[PDB]
Every structure is written in structure tokens, then in C-alpha cells.
Amino acid sequence: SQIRQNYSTEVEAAVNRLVNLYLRASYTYLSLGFYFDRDDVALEGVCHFFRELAEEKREGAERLLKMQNQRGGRALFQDLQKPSQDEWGTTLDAMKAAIVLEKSLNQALLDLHALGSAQADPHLCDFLESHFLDEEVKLIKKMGDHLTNIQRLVQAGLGEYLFERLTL
Amino acid sequence: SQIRQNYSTEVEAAVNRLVNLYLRASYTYLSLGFYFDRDDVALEGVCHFFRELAEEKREGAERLLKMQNQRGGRALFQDLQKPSQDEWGTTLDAMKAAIVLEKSLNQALLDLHALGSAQADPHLCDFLESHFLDEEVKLIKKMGDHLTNIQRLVQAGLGEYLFERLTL
Amino acid sequence: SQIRQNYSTEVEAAVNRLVNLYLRASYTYLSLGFYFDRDDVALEGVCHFFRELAEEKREGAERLLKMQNQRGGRALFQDLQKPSQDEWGTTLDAMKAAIVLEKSLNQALLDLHALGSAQADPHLCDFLESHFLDEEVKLIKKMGDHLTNIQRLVQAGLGEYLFERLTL
Amino acid sequence: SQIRQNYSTEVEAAVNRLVNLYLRASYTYLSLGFYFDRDDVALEGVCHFFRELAEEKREGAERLLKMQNQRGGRALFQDLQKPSQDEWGTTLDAMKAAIVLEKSLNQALLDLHALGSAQADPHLCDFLESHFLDEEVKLIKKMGDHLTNIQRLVQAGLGEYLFERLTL
Amino acid sequence: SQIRQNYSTEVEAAVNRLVNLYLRASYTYLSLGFYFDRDDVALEGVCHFFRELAEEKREGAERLLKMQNQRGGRALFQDLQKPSQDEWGTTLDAMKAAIVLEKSLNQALLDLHALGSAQADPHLCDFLESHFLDEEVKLIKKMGDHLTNIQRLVQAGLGEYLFERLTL
Numbered sequence A, B, C, D, E: 001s002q003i004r005q006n007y008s009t010e011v012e013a014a015v016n017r018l019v020n021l022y023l024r025a026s027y028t029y030l031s032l033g034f035y036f037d038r039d040d041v042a043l044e045g046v047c048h049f050f051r052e053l054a055e056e057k058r059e060g061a062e063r064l065l066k067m068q069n070q071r072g073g074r075a076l077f078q079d080l081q082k083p084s085q086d087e088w089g090t091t092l093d094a095m096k097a098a099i100v101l102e103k104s105l106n107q108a109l110l111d112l113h114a115l116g117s118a119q120a121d122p123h124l125c126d127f128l129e130s131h132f133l134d135e136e137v138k139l140i141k142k143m144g145d146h147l148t149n150i151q152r153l154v155q156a157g158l159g160e161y162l163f164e165r166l167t168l
């Protein structure tokens, strides 16, 4: 590419894998969101929480794709695997699966940052710090808070209703 | 009628029966609404939920009556039977009876649509789709959601209070 | 009822009968209104006059139902008989039937007031005076005025058109 | 056509015929409108009623033409026959001829819908329901109302003046 | 008195007794209100509910006093006995005592009305109907509603908190 400068093939490839990870995450949240929209689950605040995360993850993928092009790398898309579950259980189960998901994304961001540092790619480092690293830390903190409040509330049916009504 | 065109006697008659069904439903909701207004029941959000439905059902009847005249059919009114109950029990009992009621209305709409299709009456089909079919589906979904949340909340007294306060 | 005070069973029952009378009246006006909406009758001002009365009568029933609950009485609904006619003839015929109807309602209000006085129920008396007695007197006066103008106008077709156009 | 999908030659041709019918109708209303503008007829409200219908019918033709192109069909125009009359008599005569005209259009819409259903063309069905079927039913109802009021008014000269002044 | 007309000594005296009853009631509500303001009770919504009633009852006394002067009667004040309790227990206990109190006031209003009717004093009757009778009925209905919801909520501590938070 006429514009490519200091952009390793290793980072280029890892960025493509990270796009797949973010779209997979977006797909997982779409599934979570619509599960809580079922008439036999019916937790609107939980549905909205997860639908908003689906959107955030899709936007993360787009930011990575934009950056890939800015650096002269080439987007390569792969199949997107379906989410790990068809049904997501309680709000507690769902929030637990979500924090596991976010931790996996965070670890992928950290690995990518380590790769960038090894490749001496300061633009990539800045990119990850500016748009991802603190976003993830904040989100994981929030999910941790939610998990603590959910568990505090487990009269489990009553607790699930109240959390959705008064927190989400 | 000078204006009547492609409007079968079968549809005309079924429309009159459907008006009776909708007014009966409106009457049932009036009864439900005032039951929850009793000093010994006292659930204002439940009262309002049912009173609003009484109004919706009456408006459905008026829309059918207007349409009947538009097609050159003739409104024929019949006695309106009183609701199936004098007292409606808990919010749960009431919501259960309401979803049964809505399903019966929905089935009547579906039968009328099938009749219209058999009579090749596309204006009637459009009329039912535009003003009734999706309305019913949405309402039944909402009642299903409510039922799930109500059952989740059954400390039954506490649950009934909280649902009325925080959902209705 | 924990709140019931100075509210006789006789008044409670008569209030329930009066609700039935008001809903019957509302039903009668719904029928009148849609009759004048027929393409072969087509008197929009007459249709609107009666449709508005249907609404007023329904609201009267709701006021009675609200009052019943306020006093600790219990609403009991009964079958609603269909209106006395399927077709209502001329504006004159219709207005004549309407004033007969209103007189019957007025007489029921007067009987209820007499019952309340015999039961020494001053809250009921105030209720009837504030919300019904003068309303009826005013409405009956208006119908009387209309009847006089209608009869004055009977070239009967011309007269019916002009009354609907210039008065209603 | 590169875009044509599920659009039968039968429907394409019937749509072209329907365009001819709508333009013919527009032409008929133009003639009616200007007849009532004659100094020896002079009924401005009748003139305006028919001129507005001429415009509506032309717009119907344009909607059909637009739809034809959207589906990849090809507009084919044919000669437009002149209206059935040069002079249109009374408002009554004119309104009678208009309702006959609208019924013929309505029947053509119904036939086209039946053709679409036989050809399993759901886009065409939606198109007819959304833009034509209820429009026709409403218009025919209105003309029926007018006819009833006109006939009620037949002192025929006086009646024709009053209808034009107070209704149109 | 130069203005006194149709105002019996019996009514005059009963009006003075009723003023004492209303001020006693105001005093009782002042006590209730400040009890719920105690640091070891601490239910702000209950405190406010009763403090507002103290004000309403004082205003009732002033209206009676104004009316007494309007009729040419003479205000005579008597000692005001302290409330029946120093401490008022739970919200439930308090609301129960309040409805007993309101019923006693209502009965006094009814007795006064009966006296007025026996004395053929229509101004007094109008006065009681306009300013007191429906006010009492409404208040008693509300207290009945509250009692039902309170009892529904009795985890008694949790229930008392939730009622104060979500209803009062």
C-alpha cells in the first residue's frame, strides 16, 4: 500500500482477528437482548442493557476496520460463529456470561497492545488506549457492580424484578 | 344499498357479531377496572390498565360500525351479556382472564379475515390488518410479559403491590 | 366495607340499576348515531348529536360507578338490553325517542333522590344535584327546543336538511 | 428488465389498462367540472367538487405509472376516449353518473387485485390496499351520502341551490 | 343579631361543638405527624400525610367559624382535649386510628345535617354539602385504600418502608 508505514503484517492480521471477536461479541449481545424480550422472560431493562452492548461492540469493530484502512492494512472477514448459548437463564447467569465475554475481549486488546509494543507501533498503542482500553475497564467495573447487586438480591424472582426495575 | 359493492351478507353479519364481541369485551374491562378501584382491593395502576382497555375495545367497536356503514352494510345490535365474573381476584387472576379474552377476540378477527379471504373481499382484509391484527398481537405480547412478571413476583401481597407500583 | 357509612343497601342496589339504565341509554344513542351515518340517511349533524350523547351517558355510568366505590358499595353489572329499535326514521322520530329516553332517565334520578331522602343520605343527594339533575333538565330543554324547530320545519325533506345544516 | 421480479405480464398489461381507465375518469371529471362552471348552470361548489376529483384521478394514474416502473413493467399509453356526455344535467344527474364511474373504477381495482392474488403478487396487493381500495370505498360512501341529501332536497331549483351552498 | 334569620339556637350550638371536634382532630393529626418525625420512627411520607390532615382539619374549623358569623351565630370556644395517644405505633395502627377519627367527624357532619333538615335550614344543608360531606367521603375512601395496601404489605418492616416510599 502506498500509505503503509511501520504497520506489521502481524498487527494487520491480529486486527482482523479482533474484528471477528468484536462482531462475535455483538452477535452474542443481540442474542442476549432478544432472549430477555421473550414473553416468558420479559425483563425490558435487561433487554435494553444487552441490546446497547451489541451496538457498542459493532461500533468497536467498525473503528478497528476504519483504523485498518487508515494504516494501509486490508480487511479480511471470516465466518462469524453463533453465540455459545440459545437461552441465557437468569439476569445473573446472563451478566456472568457477559463479564466473561468482556474479559476475553479485554485480554485480546491487551495481547494486541503487547504485539504493537513488540513491533514498536506507537500509533496502534495510542489507538488502543484512546478508544478501547479504558472503555473495557469501565464496562467490566460496571458489570462487576451489577453482579454484586444481583447476588445481593437473590426470593430470587422478587430480586430479579427489583434489579431490572430500579437499576436497569 | 346504492354504495354496496363486493360486500357479502356473510361478512356483514360477522361484522355485527364482532361488534357485539368488542362491546362485551369493553364491558368486561369496565368491570375489571372498577373492581380494582374497590377500597378493599385498591390497586390504582391495575384499575387504570383495565379502564384504558375498556376504552380501546369500545373504539374497536366504533371502527367496525363505521366500516360497516362505509361498505353499505347495516348495523344490527344485540343484547350485551354481562361479564363472566362479578369479582376478579388477584392481579394475576385478572390478567389471566384478560389474556383469555384477548385471545378470543384475536381468534374472532382471524376467523373474520378467513371469511373475507374466502369471499375475496380485499378491502375487509386491509381493514383488519391496518386496525386490528397487529394491535391484538401487541396487546397479547404485553399481557404475556405482565403475566410473567406477576408470576415472578408471587410474599404474594408484596409482589402484587410492587408490580402495581413499579410496572403499571 | 371498612369505609361504608350511612349507605343503605337500598341505595346501593338502586345505584346499580341506574348504571344499567345509563349504559342502556348510551347503547341506544350509539345505535341512533350510526343510523344517521347510513349512506341512505346521511345526516352528519344528527349523527354527531347522538354520538356525543352516547358518550355523555357512558360518562354518567362511570360517575355512578366511581361514587358506588367511594361509598363502599359494590358494583354489580347485569346484561344490557339492545335498543328498542334497529332503524330510527326521521330526525323528528329520533328526537322524539330521545326525549322519551331522557325523561325516563330523569325520572330514575328523581326516584333515586327520593330514596336517598327517605334513607337520609345527604351525600347521595348532593351527588345527584351536582352531577345529574341540572344536566338532565338542560338536555331535556334543548331537545324540546329542537323538537319545536324540527316540527316548525316539516317540504319535509327540505326541512330535515336545513335543520341538520343550520342547527346541528 | 434487470429489476423485474415476480411481476407477471398479465398484471403489467392490466396496470396499463387501469391507467387508461383512470385518465378517462379524470377527463370525465374535467368535463363535469367545466359544465357546472357554465354561466347557464353556475354551481361553483359542484364545479369545485368535480374539478378536485379530476385531479385525484390523474394522481391515481401517476401512482400506477410510477409503480409500473418500480416493478420493471413498461408503460403503454392508448387513446383516451372522450367522456360519455357533453352536458351533465342536474347535480343529481351528475352525482349519479359519478357514482357509476367510481363503481366501475372500484370494480377494476378489485379485478386487478384478484389477478394479483392469482399471480401470487403480494407487492401489488399491498400497493392496491395502501393507495386505492379504501380511497374508493370512502369516495363512494361520500357520493352515496350526497345522493341521499340531493334526493331529499328535490322545489328542485331551490334544493339544488341549497345543496351547493350548504354542503359543497 | 341584626342579620340572624332562620338560624336555630340548636344549630348554632351544634356548630360550636363541631368546631371543637375539628380542632381536636387537627390536634390529633399534629401529634400523629410529629410522632412519625421521631428519629426512632422516621417515616417522612407518613409524617407529611398526617401534617397535611392537621391543616385540613384546622381549615374546616375556620370555615365553620366563618359560617357561624355569617349566620349571626356566636362562636363559643371550649377546652381542647389532648389526643387519645402519645405514641401511635405502626403506620397501620396510625391509619386505623385516623379512619376511626374521620368516621367520627363524618357522623358529626351527618348529625348536623339531620338537625338542619329538622330545623328546615337549607343554607346550612348547602354549606355542609358544598364544603364537608364529599370531602369526608373522599378522604375515608383514600384511607380505606391505604389500609388495604398497608395490610397487603405486612416482612412487616420491609412493608412499612415500601409503603412510605412508593405510596406516600
Ligand SMILES: CCCCCCCCCCCCOS(=O)(=O)O
Pocket: B023, B024, B026, B027, B030, B051, B053, B054, B055, B058, B080, C023, C026, C027, C030, C054, C055, C058, C062
Ligand atoms: C360511546 C359509548 C358507547 C357505549 C355503548 C354501550 C355499551 C356499553 C359497554 C361498556 C362500555 C365501556 O366503555 S368505557 O369507556 O366506559 O370503558
Ligand SMILES: CCCCCCCCCCCCOS(=O)(=O)O
Pocket: D023, D024, D026, D027, D030, D051, D053, D054, D055, D058, D080
Ligand atoms: C400531468 C398532466 C397529465 C395529463 C395527461 C393527459 C390526460 C388528460 C386527462 C385529463 C386530465 C385532467 O386533469 S386535471 O388536473 O385538469 O383535472
